[PDB]
């Protein structure tokens, strides 16, 4: 499949030492078997 060119992503926000605190505060506030046959057609790619 065509390799989906991914967006040029950055590095994380890094620890500003109250990033986790702010995230926690916001969070608290918010609170098939494969078959056993093939049945090949008449020209059969039989390896």
């Amino acid at each position: 499949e065509v390799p989906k060119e991914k967006e040029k992503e950055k590095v994380s926000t890094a620890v500003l030492s109250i990033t986790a605190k702010a995230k926690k505060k916001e969070k608290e506030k918010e609170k098939e078997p494969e078959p056993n046959f093939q049945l090949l057609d008449n020209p059969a790619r039989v390896m």
Binding site: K10, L16, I18, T19, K21, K25
Partner: protein, 727 residues
Amino acid sequence: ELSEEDKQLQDELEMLVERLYRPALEELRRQIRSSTTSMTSVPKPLKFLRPHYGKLKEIYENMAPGENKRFAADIISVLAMTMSGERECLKYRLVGSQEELASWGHEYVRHLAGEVAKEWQELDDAEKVQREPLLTLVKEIVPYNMAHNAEHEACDLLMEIEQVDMLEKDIDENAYAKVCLYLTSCVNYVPEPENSALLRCALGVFRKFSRFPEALRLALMLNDMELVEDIFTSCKDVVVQKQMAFMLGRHEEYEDLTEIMSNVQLNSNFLALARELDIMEPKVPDDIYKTHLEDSARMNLASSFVNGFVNAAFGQGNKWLYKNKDHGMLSAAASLGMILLWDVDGGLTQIDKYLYSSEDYIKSGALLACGIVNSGVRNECDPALALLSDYVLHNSNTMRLGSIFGLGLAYAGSNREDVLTLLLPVMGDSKSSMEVAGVTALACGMIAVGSCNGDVTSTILQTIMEKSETELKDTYARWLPLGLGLNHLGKGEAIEAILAALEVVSEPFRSFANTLVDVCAYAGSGNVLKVQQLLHICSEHFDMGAHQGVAVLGIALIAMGEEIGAEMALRTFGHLLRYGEPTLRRAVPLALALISVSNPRLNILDTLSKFSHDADPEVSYNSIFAMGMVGSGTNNARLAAMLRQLAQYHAKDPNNLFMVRLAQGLTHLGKGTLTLCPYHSDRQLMSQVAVAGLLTVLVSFLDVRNIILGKSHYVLYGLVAAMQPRM
């Protein structure tokens, strides 16, 4: 080493741990005499019972109540705080009936405080039952701290994870210098609304000690007008009530309380301090310049701007006003009114004489003169209100474009319902013109001053809901966001609903809307997550420009408290303009200016100079206006000299010469008597007055080519609205 007697003590410890239980408890606990020793570290029994730590811990595990199990916990927990043995064993010991700490040392007290803190962070809202014993603990420790002058550590415990009132309430008296200033600094640098928590904590300290001309200014930091009246209520001494009224105006006996609040005599005080070291001298532009040391309407505008910025409010026109050529607009009439600032007495007469005069450029200027003169002074007999409300109601530019900014000048920072009802219905401006709608939003916001007025917010929201796709992304339609921001200042996270509502606006626009709303919101306090957001929104490369511009202005506005933060932001902005796009480069000077207005530090001056002579005229204009803003109201030296060198370099550049001469006029602005600096009190107030003017000025100068070199000039007189005396 192990001197013979030291080894004998070690052998005593060995026998004690190897050997019923009452003597063991007695002597093992008394061996903490080493820690209680007023003059010693390295408590010998601590670290002599190091190999026995595991044995003692397992013995306690396999221990049951009785004669033992009571005082052995003390030794277990001291050996713990030395190594391992957390608050589970600490509180088991305390339940062992020893919380006094008298038999233990300051070292153990501090270690216990830290241990309590770290369990509190480790825990969540669940298992809150354990907190209550820990609260009684903290209550038992804090008196020990106020005894042994560990006030920093006590305030640490109080600020820890939350807000606390009991201690600073029970912090004795006449020793509050620390709890005052040190907690003021902690406040200045807090990241959360527990800022406001520490704010009213310090306020309560002041109130308990019945000396609060510091909670005076703390009132403004506490965005609670109700608290403002609460402080105003007591005012048991008229002598201090007078000072409080003067402070309120700058930012029983009812005859003069409202008079001082409205500052009907601030003009008298300013003129008296002018007489003190008199500089009263109607002047000529060249002297502010030095053209001897080396008649376009552009030169007329430059001369008028410098003259007004210098002689503002000194009470000293049509003859020299008459030289108009297209862009020869009401600038000079507003300049005369400004030179007459706060002089209502003669202001009425002069403005009436020059309003009964020629076409729009003489009547809109008169209305702006009335408003700008009324700025900063109020009275029961409302001045200029009748003229503003009756005249100039037709749909058109010029007239209302000036009149609405005049009304904002008259009654900015009032939140008065009468002018609100005057301006909100008139905000409907799809009938009128686009710049008129912009200035109407400007005045509405400048009066709102962060009032969070639902009505004005609705007006702005409906105006922006009225959308013309091509009009939005052309120019001169960003003052709806500006007014929204002015209506909402520093209220914290109470902006998400507005952001969600605005999220319907078209993608190419509304970047400015969101950014300017966000910056007019939380700012001055300093939030690292927020400035991270600002820097990242700058950092997404776009191969929009004004979006990064507003982001830059926001970094400036947010980094206006902590001087440490301001300097680091200077570093960041140097990086930005170095590795930045032209829009980002243009925006950087505005941020520098906001960081240091009228505080001309050599570093900012040097950086702006080095970036001045740029290939982009917009960059050059931004840099030279940044020079003007850093030097404003200071007469600072060598700024004029280097600026004249810059002018001579740009000898034949018309726009550059005009703007640089404006920068010189700013440099000599107010002859030092007026400064644009925010933070009037203790350099610690995001002053609702003049922040609106400064922010409007910076937003407008985000694009200088289109608006400034266009059909409008009221930005300069908005900056004047921001002006304030330095005496």
